[PDB]
Ligand SMILES: Cc1cc2nc3c(=O)[nH]c(=O)nc-3n(C[C@H](O)[C@H](O)[C@H](O)COP(=O)(O)OP(=O)(O)OC[C@H]3O[C@@H](n4cnc5c(N)ncnc54)[C@H](O)[C@@H]3O)c2cc1C
């Protein structure tokens with residue numbers, strides 16, 4: 001009876017567990033999670049208006065309800081239980097704890113009220129408890145987001161969508177309340193490089209172009225000579241560039257020009273600009289603008305980089321969101337860690353020089369893939385682990401699993417959240433959603449959550 005543990009209950013932890021249980025009929029898989037609830041970025045990252053993307057929770061739930069899987073929420077690995085205790089109790093341990101650290105801008109003014117990471121703002125509208133008191137001031141009229149990836153489009157979309165259109169999503173009631181009073185009417189999404197280097201994808205870009213009540217602001221000068229350079233591009237990429245290109249250059253028909261003219265909100269893309277400093281208001285109490293360094297591109301293909309021209313542009317705004325990526329954080333002394341790439345060093349999921357220790361998801365490869373990318377990568381880890389298990393490369397004989405761990409947690413005063421405990425809060429969140437017309441109304445206060453979890 002192989003005993004395996006998974007650290008982190010996001011898509012990498014759950015897909016790793018699903019592979020292990022599907023391909024080994026006897027193994028037991030225990031999933032540990034620091035938050036009081038499961039699912040990681042599917043609950044706290046994916047936007048409220050992309051409920052379709054969160055449907056993977058139904059298959060994760062079937063895995064967690066199975067006889068050979070168990071969930072242990074409210075357990076911070078590296079703090080409440082160490083990795084070495086886990087290594088001693090299980091045949092294999094898989095690190096799947098994501099990339100919790102936002103990359104900072106590292107620029108002067110970053111401390112002014114009105115500056116936030118995009119993930120923190122997302123965590124605020126998606127109910128991550130640690131961001132419940134973010135209280136972003138939306139009394140300004142313009143927001144600037146740095147970074148042109150899908151996370152940037154999500155934050156811009158939420159700031160500009162007519163609030164009534166978010167009423168039936170699972171967005172927190174607190175954030176929708178704040179959005180109803182927001183004075184933000186313009187959002188600029190700024191990149192250091194040019195149109196060919198954008199990182200967003202077509203579904204999200206189209207949602208922005210078609211967002212009711214808004215008009216797009218693209219400068220045709222940023223697109224001169226584009227069709228020519230995209231003739232040899234991959235199909236999906238070329239389609240994305242053609243949609244941007246049309247949006248920037250085609251003159252709209254009569255009805256669309258009228259719709260654009262009556263729009264009360266607008267969004268735009270700015271290129272060749274890198275963040276130099278956040279500018280304060282006269283009294284220093286808040287952000288009032290962003291000073292950008294003009295840039296030009298050098299290099300070819302993926303090797304292209306932005307270099308400064310010496311010119312600068314000041315762009316007035318009251319909210320600055322940095323959407324420039326993430327890094328994993330070290331977790332425990334027994335686990336090697338590369339501060340440069342912000343990943344646990346590994347060879348196809350086997351942690352360097354640590355027999356029995358593996359990794360999957362963002363902590364294995366870096367923070368760049370979508371959920372499907374995380375799923376197929378976790379299956380790769382699951383294959384190597386099971387081959388190591390079948391071949392007798394892991395310790396032979398028993399291994400206690402949770403019987404050992406719980407006896408340690410019992411003594412330390414840590415009471416883990418089981419999946420059946422989570423089911424109680426889930427039912428409560430869903431029922432509270434019935435009155436208002438939402439999928440659920442998330443509980444945000446950890447104390448109240450613990451009560452509703454039966455703790
Ligand atoms: C803002 C945002 C929006 C996104 N939107 C989409 C989208 O629309 N579509 C899409 O396909 N992908 C989206 N993604 C990408 C998707 O979120 C990632 O592909 C996926 O969640 C990465 O999975 P993961 O399991 O590695 O990490 P995560 O999902 O982060 O999960 C890691 C888990 O480990 C837990 N953990 C951390 N530390 C510990 C510890 N010490 N002990 C125990 N547990 C711990 C975390 O709490 C968490 O639950 C988005 C990402 C972000 C940031």
Ligand SMILES: NC(=O)c1ccc[n+]([C@@H]2O[C@H](COP(=O)([O-])OP(=O)(O)OC[C@@H]3O[C@@H](n4cnc5c(N)ncnc54)[C@H](OP(=O)(O)O)[C@@H]3O)[C@@H](O)[C@H]2O)c1
Pocket residue numbers: 104105146147148149150151152154191192193197198199201204274275323324325326367368369370
């Ligand atoms: N629907 C979906 O499929 C979906 C939805 C949401 C999120 N996700 C995913 O989740 C992952 C995380 O996304 P993300 O938006 O944070 O990152 P991302 O997709 O990698 O884009 C972030 C970046 O910010 C820029 N950048 C980095 N440092 C900068 C600096 N100091 N100043 C200015 N710009 C800087 C980089 O652009 P440059 O290198 O040219 O400058 C890069 O584009 C992505 O892989 C995203 O696709 C997917």
